[PDB]
């Protein structure tokens, strides 16, 4: 129609003006007098071996001790990080797994990938083994991320440019979030578990409301596909990593771009983004086999986590902020402190 | 210094390690092929002769092959193609009868150029299956090949086609020093395609075995 030519575009213009009406100062100017974090040195405290293929996913437990990892060898291993013991080893029906989640209660785990099916596995069974509790189907594209709301609800993002909130007991899609024009690569859940941000391949990250299921907000600025996303611990901001070798801290309340983390020596994309407990340090896994820790308030590279022999595919920080786990394509999980 | 429960947990972890090692040893002995095509280009026929990923397992000469079909993935290929980085070979199916349809041969050529020159398949060999021999013969006796390639200059006989079809497909491989393209002409009823795939996989495994020794 004629209106789509300008009306929507006109609205876009207004939005920019609104953002231009609030960018009186920048984050660097505000946090210019803050003392720098300084050099950050983390050593590889633990190395987890047992995966025989590229590790594509990892998720810490809420007890900050157990962690689940997924590899292309068809294995979902639940690790005791303190003693490097293998608590569980689940063989997956499909070895093309690209994501995994660990339930906050610790009773269930989730996996999914190129099979377009989110498999929920029950860990606390009277039989003493791990069995497929549920197999949620309905996504028409590869399932790239999944996060547990509780023992009964789970949000997933797939390559069909849609997200879905599933009720596990019924196995149906309680809600469907649409609006992305590209593959959704990652999603993050807010601490209050009422909103969630999903970054897609259209170089945009959308804030959705879980309750009613509508796109509350849209954030742009990236020049390539967004591969990772993570909320600030406060819950009023988030960080996105993309393929243009740039991380970006966006603001929910200001609905703008707060800060950009990039270096000229970095030309490789970001595969994973995570925050520390206080939010001062932003950890990002890169394709150059490294993992950079930035001063989230100063856009200064505080440190480099360089041990891995292949692309750092997944990254996580414990809820108590005591350790950072990195999983790379060299089939090794490394805990840093 | 461990307690009884901790020692038993360590024993369970060691048993899990043993099972994982056995499973990995079993998986490493299996051949993984990635089946690609331009849609309805003979992939179904090739699968017959031997939602998401479709895995087909078949045993030939005491060798287990797993073909992964990605036809159901309508999303962006570059976001998940790196999963198939360790496949022994890529079976690319091209229908010879699609040269005068809509252009479609040009689409197959573009797909082959994208797959062969991908940054992940820098050393993964490609087995090229040119399907529909008989229908191609019928359509080339009547319709000249100049419809697909305006620059063609040759007779319109079935003796054509490897030269100026397979040659054009192989010229898209501008990394010839690192990989080889195995081209085979096949039809509906051949029963020799499995043997050709086995021979190509033997060559690939010999090359990889040598690279492992450093000989290469």
């Amino acid at each position: 129609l004629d209106q789509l030519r300008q009306e929507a575009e006109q609205l876009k213009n207004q939005i920019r003006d609104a953002r231009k009406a609030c960018a009186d100062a920048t984050l660097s100017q505000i946090t210019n007098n803050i003392d720098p974090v300084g050099r950050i040195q983390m050593r590889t405290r633990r190395t987890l071996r047992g995966h025989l293929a590229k590790i594509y996913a990892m998720h810490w437990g809420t007890d900050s001790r157990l962690l689940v990892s997924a590899s292309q060898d068809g294995k979902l291993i639940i690790w005791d990080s303190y003693t490097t013991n293998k608590v569980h080893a689940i063989p997956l029906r499909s070895s093309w797994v690209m994501t995994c989640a660990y339930a906050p209660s610790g009773n269930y785990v989730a996996c999914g990938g190129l099979d377009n099916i989110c498999s929920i596995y029950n860990l606390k069974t009277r039989e003493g083994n791990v069995r497929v509790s549920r197999e949620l189907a309905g996504h028409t594209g590869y399932l790239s991320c999944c996060r547990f709301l509780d023992d009964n609800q789970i949000v997933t993002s797939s390559g069909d440019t849609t997200c879905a909130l599933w009720d596990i007991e019924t196995g149906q899609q309680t809600t469907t979030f649409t609006g992305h024009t590209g593959d959704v690569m990652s999603l993050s859940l807010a601490p209050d578990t009422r909103l969630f941000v999903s970054g897609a391949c259209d170089a945009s990250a959308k804030l959705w409301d879980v309750r009613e299921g509508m796109c509350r907000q849209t954030f742009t600025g990236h020049e390539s596909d967004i591969n990772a996303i993570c909320f600030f611990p406060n819950g009023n901001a988030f960080a996105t990593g993309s393929d243009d070798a740039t991380c970006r801290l966006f603001d929910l309340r200001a609905d703008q771009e707060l800060m950009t983390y990039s270096h000229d020596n970095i030309i490789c994309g970001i595969t994973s983004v995570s925050f520390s407990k206080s939010g001062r340090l932003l950890l990002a896994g890169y394709d150059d086999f490294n993992c950079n820790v930035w001063d989230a308030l100063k856009a200064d590279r505080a440190g480099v986590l360089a041990g891995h022999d292949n692309r750092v595919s997944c990254l996580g920080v414990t809820d108590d902020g005591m350790a950072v786990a990195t999983g790379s394509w060299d089939s090794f999980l490394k805990i840093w402190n | 210094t461990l307690s009884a429960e901790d020692k038993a947990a360590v024993e369970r972890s060691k048993m899990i390690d043993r099972n994982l090692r056995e499973d990995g040893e079993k998986a490493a002995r299996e051949v993984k092929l990635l089946l690609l095509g331009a849609g309805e280009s003979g992939k179904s026929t090739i699968v017959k002769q031997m939602t998401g990923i479709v895995e087909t397992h078949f045993t030939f000469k005491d060798l287990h092959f797993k073909m992964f079909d990605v036809g159901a993935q309508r999303s962006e290929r570059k976001k998940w193609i790196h999963c198939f980085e360790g496949v022994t070979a890529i079976i690319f199916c091209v229908a010879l009868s699609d040269y005068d349809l809509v252009n479609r041969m040009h689409e197959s050529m573009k797909l082959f150029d994208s797959i062969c020159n991908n940054k992940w398949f820098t050393d993964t060999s490609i087995i090229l299956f040119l399907n529909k021999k008989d229908l191609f013969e019928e359509k080339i006796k009547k319709s000249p090949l100049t419809i697909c390639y305006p620059e063609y200059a040759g007779s319109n006989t079935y003796e054509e086609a490897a030269a100026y079809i397979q040659c054009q497909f192989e010229d898209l491989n501008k990394r010839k020093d690192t990989k080889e393209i195995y081209t085979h002409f096949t039809c509906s009823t051949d029963t020799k395609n499995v043997q050709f795939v086995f021979d190509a996989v033997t060559d690939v495994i010999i090359k990889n075995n040598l690279k492992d020794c450093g000989l290469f």
């Epitope: - | 307690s3 009884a4 038993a8 024993e11």
Partner: single-chain antibody, 233 residues
Framework: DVQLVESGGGLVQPGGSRKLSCSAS????????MHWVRQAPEKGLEWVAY????????YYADTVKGRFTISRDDPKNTLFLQMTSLRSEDTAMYYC??????????????WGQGTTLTVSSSDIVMTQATSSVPVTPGESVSISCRSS???????????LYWFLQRPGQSPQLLIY???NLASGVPDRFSGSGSGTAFTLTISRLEAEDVGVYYC?????????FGAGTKLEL
């Protein structure tokens, strides 16, 4: 359902030999360590033997080492106890217990029904002092236990278990590692305490709670049970 049905009991002449079998159904027998635990007629429980998962670790009590032997047939899901040179002290009801060991696991979840074997004519000490406590239903009861050696390991876990044996029934797990409540146990039970001094508190003592309470240690391996405190009325 999960069950351990066992047989092999009866009357045995002294100096003989008998084979006790325990068929397990309803759970992954291969992934569970298995314990043989005997209870003499009227003097509480006593741990006897243990086979690990995969049969990689075998343990026996001091009073049955060498004399007894324990094995498992995983394909047939069976646990065997070959017990020879039997004496008058071996008459007891034997129980087949499952226990899986990993982080956060609950050992000694399920106990078998027990088979009576009647013969025709270091070592942490667990003490419970009081053996009989008569309390009317509806009140709160505290049951005490003590150990010769502190059960608080360097890991932070305190390996003590609280079991209940109801009249004419097999022992049931209530508390594992002194703080955790076993699955299916009502919340009215609560275990607490520190090394060398442990307690189990029942807030609203209802019916079907009368029985004998045992405190067991798991820090050293010759596992030892308490004398047993019995609840009346």
């Amino acid at each position: 359902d999960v069950q351990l049905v066992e047989s092999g009991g009866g009357l045995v002449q002294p100096g003989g030999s008998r084979k006790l079998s325990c068929s397990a159904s309803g759970f992954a027998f291969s992934s569970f360590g298995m314990h043989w635990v005997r209870q003499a007629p009227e003097k509480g429980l006593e741990w006897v033997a243990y086979i690990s998962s995969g049969s990689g670790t075998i343990y026996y009590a001091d009073t049955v080492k060498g004399r007894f032997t324990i094995s498992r047939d995983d394909p047939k899901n069976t646990l065997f106890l070959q017990m020879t040179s039997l004496r008058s002290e071996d008459t007891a009801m034997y129980y087949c217990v499952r226990s899986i060991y990993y982080y956060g696991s609950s050992p000694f979840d399920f106990w078998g029904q027990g088979t009576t074997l009647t013969v025709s004519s270091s070592d942490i000490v667990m003490t419970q002092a009081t053996s009989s406590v008569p309390v009317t239903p509806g009140e709160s009861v505290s049951i005490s236990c003590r150990s010769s050696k502190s059960l608080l390991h360097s890991n932070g876990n305190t390996y003590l278990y609280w079991f209940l044996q109801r009249p004419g029934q097999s022992p049931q797990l209530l508390i594992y590692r002194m703080s955790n409540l076993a699955s299916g146990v009502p919340d009215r039970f609560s275990g607490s305490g520190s090394g060398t001094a442990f307690t189990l508190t029942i807030s609203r003592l209802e019916a079907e709670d009368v029985g004998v309470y045992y405190c067991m240690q798991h820090l050293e391996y010759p596992l030892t049970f308490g004398a047993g405190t019995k609840l009346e009325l």
